[PDB]
Amino acid sequence: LIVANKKVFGKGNVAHPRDLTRYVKYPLYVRIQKEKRLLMKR
RNA sequence: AAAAACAUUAAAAUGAAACAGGCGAUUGAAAGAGAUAGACGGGGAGUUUGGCUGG
């Protein structure tokens, strides 16, 4: 009955998934309104 | 640097860690473009290159 059990993954010479926000290229109006706040704080 | 190979649509009970007010670097208050001033500039523009006179 030992067929269904745990199976860990690889991710060596293989791929690995991860969330990639902070890299999204938001529209020009979002970028402008986000960097505007920074200029107020710098 | 032993091997011209495979690697994806997950099991299982999150797996696959969080946060930053920076996509990652480089240059930097200098340099580019503007204005004014000096230099240089036949690369180019405009023009000139007297008269008498045994032609």
Side-chain angles (χ1 to χ4, degrees):
Chain A
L1 206 70
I2 169 171
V3 269
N5 41 34
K6 256 113 156 53
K7 260 118 55 163
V8 278
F9 248 14
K11 304 129 166 174
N13 250 22
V14 192
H16 166 53
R18 67 191 308 114
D19 164 39
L20 31 124
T21 306
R22 105 173 282 275
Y23 305 114
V24 180
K25 194 171 147 122
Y26 283 114
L28 186 58
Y29 88 102
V30 175
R31 286 185 256 138
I32 281 176
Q33 102 195 171
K34 288 203 185 206
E35 304 169 320
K36 188 148 91 223
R37 305 301 306 163
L38 277 191
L39 277 193
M40 311 282 338
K41 214 176 48 53
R42 309 270 147 103

